[PDB]
């Protein structure tokens, strides 16, 4: 039952200002002036042919990161001690009104004076800005994004997701209600749930909070290979079209007479892709968004300080002293872990595995060449115009392309049953 609302803005990638300029920020306001609407963070494609590119927004992760920046700067305006919302500008941007309804061009009087020297890795507590503190509805409406962002800002890697398993959640007709989700794709199930979170505040142990947790659970357990067509969780299991492909498509399917034995108790952990290729994996990135919403209303276990960079330690609602640790993983590698299990349980033939792996390899290469090249395009620009430096995608290091701890977390997840 969450009570502390704080978020962490993004840090500079070695730049001397938030990694975003005018050209970029302006182009982000897709669905309107509100930086809080969903379609500002995720696009909606009828999937399966995926991978959306843009001149300014190369990948889906590119957008997700960019929004994180836009909010990181702008938000520092009303969060100052004087809590003024439109007296100073940030890159020629200014808030529309107290309730932070929308963003717009700074008034001449404002453009006349210097901009706000926004800093990096800041941690703020909503309850400090009056207007947010007085209206729980408003606060809730916004936090959805704020948390979703900090879940991408705690570490220099990808978007953190939350995996939990507890038979006690299935209490009530919760079971019935899920079956209505059979047949839908993960993407669909997530997008809708995320969109509908801001409608109104909900209870931390309500049919919503629970289902969203169960879905996440189901997805991941399947993604890794623990659950499958012949080892279902109460007959539920996400089936992937063709694992490894450029754009994966998972569908919540049903399978009878192969229910697995789940151990009584409550278990949970945090996961996060570490390989740059997450910027091009819509599901992984949605799964986090969803997790974000979960946080907007429920207080999850703290993330162990030792798993995150200095700057983001001891953040009241998120990171704490001794808590659960983060589990990273390379996308490619996990693919095999996935296969191995399926094959071993007799659902996949050795031959099939070989095909999938071969594809997964082909994909990784493709996705990398791109990311790596766009990266240069950026450095090339930054040198060209040092007064408006930026990043169209969260910075990544060659090291990030390794296996580092995949097997480890693979087992860890499997150990939730």
């Amino acid at each position: 039952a969450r009570a502390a609302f704080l978020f962490k803005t993004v840090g500079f990638g070695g730049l001397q200002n938030v990694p975003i300029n005018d050209e970029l920020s302006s182009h982000l306001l897709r669905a309107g002036n509100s930086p809080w609407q969903l379609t500002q963070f995720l696009d909606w494609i009828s999937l399966g042919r995926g991978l959306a590119t843009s001149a300014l927004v190369p990948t889906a992760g590119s957008r997700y990161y960019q929004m994180s920046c836009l909010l990181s700067g702008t938000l520092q305006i009303p969060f100052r001690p004087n809590h003024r919302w439109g007296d100073i500008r940030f890159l020629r941007l200014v808030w529309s009104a107290p309730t932070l309804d929308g963003l717009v061009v700074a008034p001449p009087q404002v453009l006349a004076q210097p901009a706000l020297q926004a800093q990096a890795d800041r941690v703020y507590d909503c309850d400090d800005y009056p207007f947010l503190a007085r209206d729980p509805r408003f606060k809730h409406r916004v936090y959805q994004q704020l948390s979703a962002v900090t879940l991408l800002n705690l570490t220099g890697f990808g978007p953190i997701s939350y995996v939990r398993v507890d038979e006690d959640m299935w209490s009530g007709d919760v079971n019935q209600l899920l079956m209505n989700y059979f047949g839908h794709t993960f993407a669909e199930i997530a997008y809708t749930l995320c969109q509908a979170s801001a409608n109104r505040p909900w209870e931390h142990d309500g049919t919503y909070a629970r289902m969203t947790q169960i879905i996440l659970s189901l997805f991941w357990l399947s993604y890794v290979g623990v659950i499958h067509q012949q080892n279902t969780y109460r007959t539920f299991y996400f089936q992937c079209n063709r694992r490894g492909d450029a754009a994966e498509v998972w569908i919540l399917s049903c399978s009878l007479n192969h229910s697995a034995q789940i151990r009584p108790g409550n278990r949970s952990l945090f996961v996060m892709p570490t390989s740059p290729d997450w910027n091009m994996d819509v599901n992984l990135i949605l799964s986090s968004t969803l997790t974000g919403c979960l946080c907007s209303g429920s207080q999850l276990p703290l993330i162990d300080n030792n798993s995150v960079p200095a700057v983001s330690r001891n953040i009241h609602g998120w990171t704490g002293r001794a808590g659960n640790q983060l589990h990273g993983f390379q996308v490619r590698r996990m693919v095999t872990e996935f296969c191995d299990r399926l094959r071993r349980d007799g659902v996949m033939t050795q031959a099939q595995q070989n095909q999938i792996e071969a594809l997964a390899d082909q994909t990784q290469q493709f996705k990398r060449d791109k990311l790596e090249a766009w990266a240069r395009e950026d450095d090339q620009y930054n040198q060209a115009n040092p007064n408006s430096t930026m990043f169209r995608t969260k910075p990544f290091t060659n090291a990030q392309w390794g296996r580092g701890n995949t097997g480890a977390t693979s087992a860890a997840i499997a150990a939730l049953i």
């Binding site: 399966g48 059979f182 794709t185 749930l193 979170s197 109104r200 309500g206 919503y208």
Partner: protein, 147 residues
């Protein structure tokens, strides 16, 4: 309920509504019930407009009938498909001469019951084969009309 005099049914849908005015076997009952369990109990988080996509409510009814419709629900829900699947199906059938695309927006309460097990289709087609029963009349058309 729908129609006129919706408030006419309240009296029957919620026993607890009538107070405990007199001393009667009926009231002795009402007096025995708990106040808090009546009306809407829990609702969906997702909604179109200001209306919820689904809701749970307390009201006169019978466990048996409810339980039945419960399974009927399930059964249908399991038969769900999503347009994206249709795209693959129709497209594959075409042997690659055309390509179908079925656009759609995000929704979870879009019921499209069409998926079944081969087993079921086999059982069904055995029934078809038995129907012929050596009566040319039954086949005559299929063959012709196809040619």
């Amino acid at each position: 309920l729908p129609g006129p005099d919706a408030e006419k049914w309240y009296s029957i849908m919620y026993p607890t509504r009538m107070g405990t005015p007199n001393v009667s076997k009926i009231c002795n009952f009402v007096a025995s019930c708990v106040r808090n369990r009546v009306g809407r109990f829990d609702r969906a988080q997702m909604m179109n407009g200001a209306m919820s996509e689904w809701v749970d409510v307390f009201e006169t009814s019978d466990a048996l009938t409810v339980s039945i419709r419960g399974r009927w629900m399930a059964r249908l829900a399991r038969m769900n498909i999503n347009p994206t699947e249709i795209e693959w199906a129709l497209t594959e059938c075409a042997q690659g001469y055309v390509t179908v695309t079925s656009p759609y927006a995000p929704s979870v309460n879009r019921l499209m019951p069409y998926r079944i097990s081969n087993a079921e289709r086999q059982i069904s087609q055995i029934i078809r084969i038995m129907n012929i029963g050596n009566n040319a009349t039954v086949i005559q058309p299929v063959l012709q009309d196809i040619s």
